[PDB]
Structure formats: structure tokens, C-alpha cells
Design a protein around this ligand. Sequence first.
Ligand SMILES: *[C@@H]1O[C@H](CO)[C@@H](O[C@@H]2O[C@H](CO)[C@@H](O[C@@H]3O[C@H](CO)[C@@H](O)[C@H](O)[C@@H]3O)[C@H](O)[C@H]2NC(C)=O)[C@H](O)[C@H]1NC(C)=O
Lengths: 532, 532, 532
Amino acid sequence: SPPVVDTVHGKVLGKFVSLEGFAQPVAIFLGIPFAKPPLGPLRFTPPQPAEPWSFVKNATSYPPMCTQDPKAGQLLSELFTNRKENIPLKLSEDCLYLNIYTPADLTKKNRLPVMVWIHGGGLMVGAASTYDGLALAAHENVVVVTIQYRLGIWGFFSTGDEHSRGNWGHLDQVAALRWVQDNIASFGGNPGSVTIFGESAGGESVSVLVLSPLAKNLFHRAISESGVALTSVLVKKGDVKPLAEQIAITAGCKTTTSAVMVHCLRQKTEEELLETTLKMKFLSLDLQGDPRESQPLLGTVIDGMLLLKTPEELQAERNFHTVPYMVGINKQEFGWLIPMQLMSYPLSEGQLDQKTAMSLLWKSYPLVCIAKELIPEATEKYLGGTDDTVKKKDLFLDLIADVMFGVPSVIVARNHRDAGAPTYMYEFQYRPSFSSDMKPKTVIGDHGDELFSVFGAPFLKEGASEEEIRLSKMVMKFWANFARNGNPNGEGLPHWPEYNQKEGYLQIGANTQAAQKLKDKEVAFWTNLFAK
Amino acid sequence: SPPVVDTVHGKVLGKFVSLEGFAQPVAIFLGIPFAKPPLGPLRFTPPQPAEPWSFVKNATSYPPMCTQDPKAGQLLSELFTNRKENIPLKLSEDCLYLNIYTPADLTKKNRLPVMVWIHGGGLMVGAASTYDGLALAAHENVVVVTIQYRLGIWGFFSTGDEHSRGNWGHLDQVAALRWVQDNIASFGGNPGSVTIFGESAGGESVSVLVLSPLAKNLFHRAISESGVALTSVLVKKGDVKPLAEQIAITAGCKTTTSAVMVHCLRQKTEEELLETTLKMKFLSLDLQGDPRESQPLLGTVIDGMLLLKTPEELQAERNFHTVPYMVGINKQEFGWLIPMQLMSYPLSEGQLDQKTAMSLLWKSYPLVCIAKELIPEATEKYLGGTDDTVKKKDLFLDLIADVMFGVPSVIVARNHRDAGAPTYMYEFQYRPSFSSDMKPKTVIGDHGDELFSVFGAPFLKEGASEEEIRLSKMVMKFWANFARNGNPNGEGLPHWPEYNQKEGYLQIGANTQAAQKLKDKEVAFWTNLFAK
Amino acid sequence: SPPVVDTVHGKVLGKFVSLEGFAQPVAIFLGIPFAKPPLGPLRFTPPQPAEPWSFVKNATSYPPMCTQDPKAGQLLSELFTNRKENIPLKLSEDCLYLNIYTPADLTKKNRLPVMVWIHGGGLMVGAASTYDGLALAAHENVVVVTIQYRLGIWGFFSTGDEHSRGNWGHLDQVAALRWVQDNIASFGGNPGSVTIFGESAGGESVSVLVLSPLAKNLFHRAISESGVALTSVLVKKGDVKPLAEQIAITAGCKTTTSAVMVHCLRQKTEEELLETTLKMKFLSLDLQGDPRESQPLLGTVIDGMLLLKTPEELQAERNFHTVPYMVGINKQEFGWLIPMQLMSYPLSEGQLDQKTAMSLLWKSYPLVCIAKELIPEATEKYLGGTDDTVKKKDLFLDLIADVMFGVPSVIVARNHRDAGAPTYMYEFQYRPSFSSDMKPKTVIGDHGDELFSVFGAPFLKEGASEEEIRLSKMVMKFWANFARNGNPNGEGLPHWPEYNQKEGYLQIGANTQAAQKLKDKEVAFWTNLFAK
Ligand SMILES: *[C@@H]1O[C@H](CO)[C@@H](O[C@@H]2O[C@H](CO)[C@@H](O[C@@H]3O[C@H](CO)[C@@H](O)[C@H](O)[C@@H]3O)[C@H](O)[C@H]2NC(C)=O)[C@H](O)[C@H]1NC(C)=O
């Protein structure tokens, strides 16, 4: 007796899964289309409503993930999946689907809080199917929705004008949120209480939706995990046309006009555009050439529809959605994963000098926009204290991590607090046992380590210790409490203080205690240095 | 002074033709477009209204026939044409046209009955231009409309969901009927009196329109000639996606998703799709491999728009148009044409044993859906009586013919009668002299033999005998009387009884007399056997 | 402080240029899109409104010219440009742009007359950017708009029916005029006073707009310079389909149906269509083959939307816009440019006999539609007076020029006068010093010589004499007076009489005086001869 739900566009057929320790099973719906496939002429256009179907659609198979680099996507899913076994996925330009995990009795009337997950991957890779919402939904009684969006060229190609504005992935996210508003009541969810949360590029997308006016009334709480829009690498500011012309030339198109480029790209096949994507070599640090010329990836643009101004100007004007907002970072954002596995840094030597540190900080211009004159001052600020190079390598990693994640997050939290909205901050400092054997094991709080506690990995995977299980339960309860109340606090949990003029935050880990003034001196130093 | 008619979309220039024995000439209009050409993006989509034209359109040339196998289409047109010479035709995806033959005085006010002809061909081949409506229109004072519709992949490709529902040819038929409703008053016809008649796949299409709700008020009488929707070979029930994926793989397309297949097939040229059609080898019995795997052709599906349920379920609920309905079969539906010429059967030996009969009945699974356990009982029922193999071959042909045409037609007539609508039945048993020299001359009432009497071949072709002329006159008068009155009976004609609890029918031939209980014992035996 | 103007679709950033002797600079806006790019499926379709843009558009770069033969386009721009240096241009199917030159103080309220320029080129070549409106706008305080339109196959391909009607360039011109009506008030112009003027194919375009009902209320004055719709070479009358099938076969497309041809051509790339254009060899006299078969170019057709009837029938019924109209010709329209540089005539010998004259007049059938029987009488009329073959070549050039330009212009002026609208005529007889060194210097009033006076070449280019400067000032003042008043006359100018039963006209040149009965005997002779 599988569950059957009746959405506006038709009826879907689900699947009951049972989690240990819970009598009620969770209804799971894999691959619900929230938008019309963006194929052919619809490429590089805003998403359109899905066409209604006539008979019950089977929703028990994982959808394809958006076309991307298969190796990088597979590696990212393996690294970030909370299920015991990694599920293979198929690439497709038809990828605008979402997965629903609802623990509600679909027979009765239920209004549960809805948490919508946005996956990371630098806006280039990633899949919604990587994350299983069975444990979180079962434990916390929330409806978990994991959405997909266009990536890479398909999602963020822009000519800088009205012919290809860009920001197609964020428009897909807005369309998915509208779908949730329209249909989540049939799955037991409460559309009047929707929380968006994401990690890395997902956190940047969450921040963008907080800034965007297109997303008004589509959510009520927000969580940013290791990502904000102030992160310079993802938000593309300046002249966007040189990158479009480079992409078009690589694809083999004429660059006479924006319309000509867009038309010629719309005629390309999926394989040709994926070959162009591989040729461009995104998400790879360029060891040779001028650092400022290299482009790490395609990303958000100030197109005039999704974002009217830059995030800095909008935050200055207080022109954003004033919802309860949670912003947090991991203790070592740049410890192992991003440098070694994701972008193949040359720091495998284990020793870093002052000269090599300055050279590598200049080579890292795309990630961190530091002018060459400011490089020596930063490198002396961080690496100057210690003489041994072993510690200096860790200090260089800390220097990169602060600029990329820590200062922007604290600045965004301060601006959100000043606008009068409730703000909460945390710093996750813990090393999951599910980590790769490649990690040196000196890394605690690597990028994405809080994902295994947010989605209840200890209950889906094997070999967790008791403290890890308790940490997962505590983090899931904090997230669900924030989703339903806009305030993470609850009974049986350590007190999480609100981020205010005291700047209190929570240090999440083996020992969970409150602290104050997160990244205060780092923020001060980098703010002074950049204004130089 | 050729006739000029002003349709809603513009004005058309016709042509006067004079038939012997009739003073008034017949106005003929060849190639009137009733819909927009289904080219490029419009492929695999419902038909759209035709764009209006500004100056008088010349309508004196036969239109192209829908793209199909040229050899098979030419052979079928030569076999079934009632004109003295066969007219060559050109393939095109732009084929949604119709031909009109009106004997009315276009100067005066005329409201003549309108007969709309749907051509056969297994939904894979055929053309409207094969049939000349000059003789019937001249003799009976009716407006004859011969329509074309999409065939093969173009007309009936389906993925089983909303991305490509299927039944494009049937929607073309509905569009042509709506065009008739809108425009047939300008040609002297009466839109309030419209009769649809067809043969083979045309009869199956007529039955489908009787069942479809999209066709409400578009016709008032119906004739089925050697074809109904209960004919299993044409209606595709089950899972439609494996056939779609086979077609896509043959065409060279990816099968990742329904939308992917549909988009990739829309990029193929006409030549590539016709090459795929020839590769698939439709309308050919597979002598090797599992019979149940082989697909004879693309056909009607239960897509939710044209047909909401299966014909059996719809007939059980009495959910169909209760118009006067004429259903008939030929005496030998499987005598020569279909097995020898159309499908190239191996039955040319002239001798058939019991073992070979059972083997061939199993090989014929696509045409007749007989489970292998039921094969021996079916073969002993027919072939068991006689010992000589010469008669056993004819009995095997009768076995195939009954299952394909006879039992389904009688069942449809019984259901229609029970629903309370007037039903009439006939069995045509005559051998036209215009038959091919290849026929053994022992076949009387071969498939499509009644066509030479329905469309007045004796008056267009050369060498007819007096009895053939009289039979053609009688059949044309019966058809016209049914069209204008819903009851074929008239003065000077043998009494044709209504199909009711007595089950009276007409035996049309050299001797025309009424009989009772057509195919009663065959229907009983095949109904009992299938429910086993 | 560049000028910024807010059009309906957005804001545009201009550029200030200063002309000697004028304190106020002229605001120049290069490349404003008035329509959506006609790319892909929009090829062979009426123009659609432009999509609005979000931020100020940069409008300081010349747009691309419509795809065409690059060599011929470059040569024509060099020959006809009034600027000191010829500006290179880039081909593109995205070419529906216009350039604005406004001398108004954009800060204040200004309502200046608007003069809209249509460029020539036989509807096959040409660009708007060739002509600089700085001098005219500065000298006369008028807003000058130079528009572009689709050319060649892209602009005038027609199948003769509703699938591809044709006249896409004329519809582009109508769209640009509507853009002017909507937006010219923001640039200081007066939409209630708009004048359209053109040359060669631009004059034929002006005449077509005068005759068309689609252009009602889009202009209030008109000027035709060496071109009218009565010119047979540009207006294609008869059966249009053979030319379409020739084009399709050259491009490699099927010719089964009009829809098939249009669809197959829409799939061709720009390069393939340009290769087809070069293969067809338009604008070249065919020295071999039947003259009547050769097609010089694609042009206007009676499609039923833009032109309901032929120009002769429309003029007979007086069914045209009765606005003040100026029609003029140059003294030697066929002297040097068109025969030698544009179409490569064989008249470089310098001697022309009677037999060779008759042969070349027969070969010239596409330009002049003279039946072979009328050739001897036409050739004896002109060439018969003089015995020396030196003068006979000039008389042959006069014969061609009269038929092509002079008789049609006087006939059109007479028809316009009879309908009751004000009419004015001129004959420009002067030799610019900016002419090519290739001219024999015996040519005075060559084709396009008045352009250097209309657009103020003496002030932009170098080396003009005093009389040339005075002539340019006089012509510019006459044109502006006609634009603002509908009557060229003013103070300090020679009296220009109105074309009436006296048939007065103005002989523009070094000596500017009024005359009467322009081309009376030529018109009489050619009218009698053709009606034979
Ligand atoms: C609108 O577009 C025009 C181009 O059509 C822009 O003018 C051009 O801008 C470029 C870059 O700003 C100029 O090149 C620059 O030259 C200076 C001096 O040599 C050099 O230092 C820079 O590194 C750069 O190479 C170019 O000269 C200028 N003019 C032309 C004719 O190209 C204009 O700035 C644009 N307006 C906007 C975007 O508001």
C-alpha cells in the first residue's frame, strides 16, 4: 500500500521506508519535477511550469543529476553522502527534480515544518540525491525537501545583458520554492513555515535568496553553512562579457554579438557543452599565467532580476528579507578537502616558507582577491609569528580559510543583526569517523564535517561512536528547533545565545559551550587591510 | 469558370469533373490544409489551426502523402485504388490535407449529407488521394471528404507520459472533423449530418472516435469496415516505453529520459526518421526470435486525452457515442492480400499440417494474442475436422481471420446494441474483377474487396460486368441511405434488418439476403478460450 | 557627462560630438535595437518588439550591418560614405538597429522635425552606419535617424503564399518607424512631424511605404531620390515560386512544399545562406543564357499584408498616403557607377554600334523589361540620331537611365499630383569632387551624387570648393524646409515651384533654376511603346 499524493500537476506514487526506533515509516518521493525540462530553446531561460500528467507518476527512482563533470560529481557525492553506500547517478539536462521525505501520516491532517536543502559544489557539481533525509525527518518530525538546480554553463552562463542575463540556477531554486508553497500541504508539510538551508554554494544560494526580492514570502527561516554571498569567488562582479566570449570561442561559436553567442550555444548538444566545460577546466587553480585572468567558475551576477545591486550595497541599504538567520562555519574550512581533493593544491609537501607562502597566496587570487601589495602584509600577519614551517603551513591554511569563509560570515551576521532580524552563529569543531582515510587526522572541523551531524549519518552509516550519535542528535534537534521556532534553543540542550552586540555563538563539537566575539580580530584586520 | 469557395482561412480554387450519365459536374478540391504543418518543434504535438492565406489558393493538385515506406504505400494504393490509373504520390511531413468531392450547385443553397473517409494501412502507410470520391458523390448526392493523418513514428510515437502522449494521427482526424464542422457548409455539405467511415486501420480509427470524448458532436453516424478498436494488433496496451527506447536507440538517440528522447527525435530529419522506420521493419512477421517481443507497428495508446480507459472498459461502462453504427467484415479477411502481399506469410506452399499450423499460430502472436498453451486447442478446433492439408490451410486462414476481425466486430456490435444505439451488420462475400491476377481465384470476399463497390470502381475502371455494376449501385445506395437516415433501408433494395437480440445481418454479394447470428459460435468459443 | 536617454525598453548611453561653427554639440546614439534579433525560428517572420534591458545600454559603437556580400557592401559604403574615412563593419543576422543624431538640448524640451533615412543597395547590400548625420543635424536643427533592415534572402525570401509571404525588410522599416513614433520624443524629436527619405532601393522603399496601409500615420512627408516602386527591377511581379525553388536547390534544400522549403532554410546557418547568396550571383548581368530567365535580385512582392495590389493598380485607385512628396532624379543615373562599378557592364570599350546596342539592350532585360520586338524601335529612337559611335554610347546610357529612373519617377509624381497631394521634383546635375578617380570626369549627375550634398559631405570631408559648400548648404536647407513645412521653399533660396499641371521642377547644380515639363517626351514615347 504505497502512499499516493495528489499534486496540482498530477498524482505521484511514493515509497515507505522504516528507520530503526521509529514505528511510523517515512514516505519517500524520488524525482518529482517542479519545472519543465530546459531542453533546446529553453536553455538559458527562466524555468517554466511543469506540464500536468494524466496517470499516477511513479516516484520511486532517483532522478538524474544536472549535467556536469562526472568524475568530480561522483567524488563529491562520495565525500558528502550520509548513506552507507554511494548511489550512482546519470547526467542529464533534464534535472529539475526534487526528493521529499515526510514522516507525516498522509491519511490524517499534518502541518509539519518544511526544511528545503540546497546542495553545494561551487555551482558546478553536486546532486540532490546525494543527501538522504530519512534520519532527520524520522528523528525531528519535519518535511525534508532536497532540490536540484542547473549548474555550470547551463545554470550560470551570462552575456551581461538582456539576451542572457544569467542566474538560471537561482531561478530554478525560486521555482522549487514556489512549488513547495503550492504543493507541500499535500505531503503533510506546512507552507506557512518553510526553512531553507544549504552548505558551501548552497549557503551562498541561501544568502542570495535572502537578498533577492523574487524570493519574498517563499521561506521563513534560513541557515547558511560555510557559505555566504559576500564570498567573492562565487559572486561574479565586474564585466561578465570576456568570460562569455571565452566560453563561446571554446565551444566554437562566433562572438559577433551577445544574441549571436546565445543562439549558437543553444544549438550545441549536451555532449559538446560538457566537452567545453571540461576544456575550460573550472574549479582548478592555475599554476601558470596571470592569476587575475583565471576564472575559477561561473556564478552569480548582478543581472537586474534576481539581484538588483551587489550584496554589499543591498546589505548597506538593509534591503533584504529580515527572517531568523543562522550563519556558521567549520573550524578548519581549508584544512584538507578543498585544497587537496577538490582543487589539487600543491601544499602536499607539508612545509611552507614565507616566499612560497606569498607566491601561493598570489596564485590563489581567484579564491581570495588580495592585491599583490597586500600579500606580504597578510603573509607576515599570519605566518610571521612562528618560525617552524610545519606550523606555518597550517597558518597559511587558516589565512585562506578566514578570508574565504570566516570574515564574510561574521560580516553578514553583523549586518543581519543590525537590520533587526534574529541572528545565530556557530563554529563546528569535530572530526567525523566517516571521514576519508586520506585525511591526516590532525584536521578537526574540515569543510563539510557538520553535514554528517545535520543529516543523521551515524544512524544510516556503520561504526559511529556514542559521542558521535549524541552530537548528531543534538545538532538535528537544534536545526529542527530553529526550523519550527526560528530559535535553536530547547529543553535538554546547551544554551545557544543569540548573536547580538555581545556577539555570542555556539562552539559545536565534543564539548558544546557558548563563546563570544567570533572572528572579531580577523574581521577587523581584513577589513582594514582591504580598505588600503 | 472553375468553382471558388471561401473557407474561414481563405478562398480555394476547385475543378469541375463530369461523370457519365450525370448532367451536373462534380466540384473537386484537392489538397485543402486543415492544420498547420507539423514540422520541427511541432513534431509529436497536437495539430494546430492553419494560418490563413491572402489570395485564392489553387486546389487542383493532389497533396503529398504522409512520409512512410514508399514501396509499401505505392503497393497499397495500387491494390486499393478505384481509379483506372494509379496516381504517383510524394512523401512529406507536411501531409495534413483533405480532398473534397461535392455534387452540389455551389451557386445555390445545398445541405447534403457529408461522408468523411479514413483510409487504412495499419496506421503505417496509406494516402487519402488513393480514393476517388467522384462516382459515389455523383451517384448518391453526398459530399465526400477524404482526409490524411500522421502515420508511423510521426503519428503514433509515445513515451507513455506527458512528454509524448501519442495518438497524433487520431488528433489529426479530430482536427479534420472540426474543420468539416466549420467549413463544410460552404461546399454544399450539411455539418449537422456527418458520417465517418473507414476500412481496416480506418475502421479502427472510426471505432476509436466512437469511444473518444474529444469527438463529441463531430459526427452523427459511423461505419466500420473490417476493423474495430477491439482489434488487439492496433491498440497498444501495457508498457509503451520499451518500444520508445528501441525506436530511440535505432534512431541513435539517448534513452536517459522521456524528455531527452522526445527532444532528440525532434532534431532528426525526415530522411533519418524514415531510415529508422525502415530499420524497425514494421508490418513484417518475425520468423525468428520470441514472438511476444516482436512489435508489428505503432498504434493507439491509452494516453488519457483521446482514450481515458481501454476500449473494453469503456464498452463495459457504455461510455461511448450512441450514434447509429454499421460494422461489417468480409467473408475471407485473411484469404490472400494481408498474408501474401502485405506481410509476406510463408503460407504459399499450399499445404499446412497440424504441427506447422501450431508453430505458425505461435509465430503470429503479434497479430493474434494467443498464449502458447491455448495454441493446440485453437488449432484442433479449426484444423481438426478435416484430414486433407489443402482444406486445413484454408481453415488456418479462417482461424486467423476470425480472431483478427470477426469476433471483435460482433462483440463491438453487441455492446453497441446493448447500449441502446442502432446497430447494423453485414458480411461482404464477392470477388471483384478488378482484383490482382495473383489471387488464386478461389478467394471470395478478400480483405478490402468491398471498397470497389463502396467507391464505385465499376464506373471509373474498365471491364466491369452487369452484376458488378448492380452490386456497386446497391452498396453505394445503402451507404448513402445510412449516411442520410442512419438506417440503410430504402425502396428498391433488399431488406437489411437491424442488429438486435435476433442478430440479423446482411450477406452482401451476388445474392444479397438477410441472415441471423453472425459468428455466434466463433465468438462463444474464442470468448471462453481466452478466459482460460 | 555623456547624454543618457530613457527609452521605453530601457536607458541608452550616448556621445557628444562637436562640429565646427556650432557651439552646441550633437548627441549621437549608435546601435539602438528597435526589434528582436531575427535568429533561428524568427528567420522569415515579421519583426517582434525588443526585450527590455535592465541597466543603461552603451550606445557608442556602430552596429553590425545585415549579412550580405562583404566585398560589395564595403565597396558601396566606400563609394557612398560622406565621412572622411570609411568605417569597417561586421556582418550579422542581428542587424535591426538604428543610429540617432539629435542636436537638441536633451535637458530642455525640444520638438524638432525627424528625418528618417533608408539606405540603398538594391535591397541586397548597404548599411545605415555608412551615412553620418552630424553635418545635417548640426546645420538644420533636425533629428536624423538612420535605420537598418534585412537584406537579400534574409529580408525578401518568398514562396508566394502564407508560409513565407516575403517583404521582411519593409516590415522592419515599418517597425523602425513605429519605434520612432514611440521613442523619438525622448531624443528631442517631434513624432507628429516625421519625414522618410531614401535613395535607390531606399527611394523604392519610401514609395512602397507611401503605397502601403501598414505605414499609416508613421510619417508626414516623403522624399524619393533616384527610386520609386514603379521601377520594375525591384518589385517582383508574376509567379514568385520558381525563384524560391532555385534558391532552395542552391542551398541544398528539398522543394516538395513551401513549408518544407521554409523549414529547411530556417535550419541553415548564416554561413550557408551567405554561400548560397554568393552562388546565386545577384546584382550581376548574365552575359549568357536567356535574359528573361535571369533574376537580378530579390525584392518586393505583392504579399497581401504590406502591398495588397500592384503599385500601378494602387496608384490608379489613388489608394496611397497623400502626404507632401518629393521625387527627383540625377541627370545621368546610368553614367558610371551602376554599369561599371556595381554590375560590371561591358561598355568599357567606349564605342557602341547599333547591333551591339540592340544586343546589350536585350541582355539588359532584367533591368529594363523591353520585349525583343521593341528593342529595335527603342534603339533607333535614341541611337539613331547620331552617326558617331562615341555619342551613341552616351545615348544608350541615357536610354537605360530613362527607363530605369526617369519615366517611372515622373509618372509617380504625376499620379501623386492628380490625387491632390503636394508634389515637388528636382533634377540634380553636378559632379562632386569627392568622386572616385575612376570616373571619366565627363559624368555630371552620376547615380548617388546628390548624397554628398544632402548629408553635408563638404564639411566632414576634405578639399571641398566654395561652390560645393554653397550647394551643400542650399540642398540641406531645402530638405530641412521640406521636412518641417512640407514645402522646400524658404528665404534666401531660389524659388522651387510646385509640381502641378505646369510640371515645374528644380534643376539643382552649380546654376540652380526652375524648369518645366521634366521628361515629358520620354514619358510619352515609353508609355506608347510599352502599350504595344
Ligand atoms: C562603451 O563602449 C565604448 C567602446 O565602444 C567604451 O569606450 C572604449 O573603452 C575602452 C575601455 O575603457 C577604451 O580602451 C581603453 O583605453 C585607455 C587609453 O588608451 C586604456 O588606458 C585602457 O586600458 C583601455 O585600453 C577605449 O579607448 C574606449 N573607446 C573606444 C573607441 O573603444 C566606453 O568606455 C563604454 N562606456 C561605458 C562602458 O560606460
